Design a protein around this nucleic acid. Structure first.
Ligand SMILES: Cc1cn([C@H]2C[C@H](O)[C@@H](COP(=O)(O)O)O2)c(=O)[nH]c1=O
Ligand SMILES: Cc1cn([C@H]2C[C@H](O)[C@@H](COP(=O)(O)O)O2)c(=O)[nH]c1=O
Lengths: 318, 318
DNA sequence: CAAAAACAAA
DNA sequence: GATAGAAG
DNA sequence: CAAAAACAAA
DNA sequence: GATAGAAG
């Protein structure tokens, strides 16, 4: 069509109107305005004018940033005007800048694989996680699960289901059943909707109980179901402060201690203790991380560290 | 321009005219004809007609095949009419079929990583290679180098340079300096033209001498410099028969023994004996195989087998 | 007199 | 086809 | 009476 | 941007 409103954005601008403090929502503003402007636009060249002006405002911002912004625009257009709107053929970044973006990523990752960080104090890190599994503070439990199960924060906190995994005619003690994969949309070969088994790094018993507590806390019951902008607003800076605090003294010198660090390490340790002999590391990761079928490319991003044992062994060839 | 001839094709058709035997060069024929037809064509829509007819002849052939054929066409056009000819915007496969081709590859490789083949008798395989390093028959030596150094056949046989590698203030005994990477064209981040160090699987001494012999044999001196269609014609079926013969009794049951098998295994063993602790397997491969800078995607294709030791270890976690 | 959305990076 | 860590 | 380019698959 | 294992 030629009309409709981006409800979600508007909502956010409206709340923003009466906050005790905070910087101005100028970008949600540009988007809202843009969407208004589009109403009763039939002509491509006009739509092009509107987009091109938007692009030009964004000059100065970082490439990675610009690209993210373009997504906010696109979801807004899609929300307001549906999927079929010709503005979605226009509102995109140019191809050259995408091409460079790719290059940049390849370079980064290629550099990590050539310079893995030795996770000297890793066992300490996992103990700490295990211990947080026993904390009264739901946040702490959460951190504990990210360390122990490898689920992303958003997963742990707002939407993960954890079943006990059947191990023959009993119960698996080194893995649980997980559901609520994020970053995934329905489709052949996709973990969306799918329950599946992932190794964990301490008694399935423990883990499962801890998730029960978290699920039942006040803050937990709040978290449960939150969209991502919600969850980020509620919890991101807190969780980042906590994790920084908590692991600061044991994290490899090379980098600062961040929540996703747990998922990276988790993959590494799980592989190291549990990987069967006939699958590759890339495969094992893409498996335990809930990656799409045949997606082996994404594993490459989690190859971050090396365990001091593995490092010691390489050196054992002198 | 609007004129020129594909010299190489013509040459091949001409030789073909008086062979004692062999099937008819009908495809080089279609290409030659096509190139003739293009002479004095200025109009896109005509060029489109010519291509579309070519495409339609190719129906029935396999996708992988068709795509290869399209390359022969394109190199022919490029040879005859240069790089700038608008027919190169037309002579290509459709995008849907490429997209599927990609899918197909991803699926294949994703399947190998989930079902690695245990190379039970691998040490036998490498011994055999070592022993061929001592054969009087240059072919045999060649096989020996593919097993021992990981260079592709075309590399070993026609254009590889092997220096001794400096190891501190002496000489490296577990690696040599290599040059003549094939499948590579000049460019930032490319091993073309580049000498570089690759591990080998037996005394650098041995290897280097053996390559000297091969280089100095009659057949060697012939091989040296051959284009790829030459080399294939001269040597491919022979080398495939030999390798089939030679390794038939020790190759994993799962697959037949083929020359590239050596390069796959080579990567695996080199990693297993020589990989430093701070680099990933993907990285190590892309390194020792002469892959482009930041190319980590191509390593994924060489992850084919698993060593019975590594397999035994995985199982050691019961 | 010193806490609570933009900008950016698998 | 481009998505989902500076206002008492 | 039985060896010497098409077709295809990193 | 698409390249490089059935004629004595
Ligand atoms: C460019 C892009 C990358 N990705 C991530 C996921 C994988 O790690 C990788 C693609 O390989 O990039 C997305 O999820 N969406 C995108 O639009
Ligand atoms: C599609 C294509 C693949 N490749 C190979 C090399 C890498 O293994 C892989 C790309 O990733 O495919 C080429 O060399 N050229 C091509 O045109």
């Amino acid at each position: 069509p030629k009309t409709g409103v981006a409800t979600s954005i508007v909502e956010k601008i409206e709340r923003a109107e009466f906050n005790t403090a905070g910087r101005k929502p100028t970008v949600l503003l540009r988007i809202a305005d843009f969407i208004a402007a589009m109403n009763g636009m039939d002509a491509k060249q006009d739509m092009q004018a509107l987009w091109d002006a938007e692009i030009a405002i964004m000059n100065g911002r970082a490439q990675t940033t610009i690209i993210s912004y373009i997504t906010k625009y696109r979801n807004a257009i899609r929300e307001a005007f549906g999927d079929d709107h010709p503005m979605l053929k226009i509102a995109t970044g140019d191809a050259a800048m995408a091409d460079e973006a790719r290059r940049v990523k390849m370079e980064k990752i290629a550099n990590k694989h050539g310079a893995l960080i030795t996770f000297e104090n890793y066992r300490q890190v996992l103990k700490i996680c295990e211990d947080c599994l026993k904390s009264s503070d739901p946040l702490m439990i959460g951190i504990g699960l990210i360390g122990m199960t490898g689920r992303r924060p958003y997963e742990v906190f707002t939407q993960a289901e954890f079943s006990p995994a059947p191990y023959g005619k009993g119960v698996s003690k080194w893995s649980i059943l997980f559901n609520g994969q994020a970053k995934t949309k329905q489709g052949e070969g996709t973990k969306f909707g799918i329950t599946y088994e992932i190794p964990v790094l301490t008694r399935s018993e423990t883990v499962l109980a801890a998730y029960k507590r978290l699920r039942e806390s006040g803050q937990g019951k709040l978290w449960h179901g939150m969209s991502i902008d919600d969850f980020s607003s509620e919890t991101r800076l807190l969780l980042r402060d906590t994790v920084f605090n908590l692991f600061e003294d044991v994290w490899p010198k090379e980098e600062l201690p961040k929540p996703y660090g747990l998922r990276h390490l988790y993959a590494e340790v799980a592989y190291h203790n549990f990987a069967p002999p006939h699958v590759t590391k890339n495969s094992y990761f893409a498996a335990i991380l809930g990656h799409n079928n045949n997606d082996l490319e994404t594993s490459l991003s989690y190859m971050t560290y090396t365990l001091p044992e593995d490092r010691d062994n390489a050196l054992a060839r002198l």
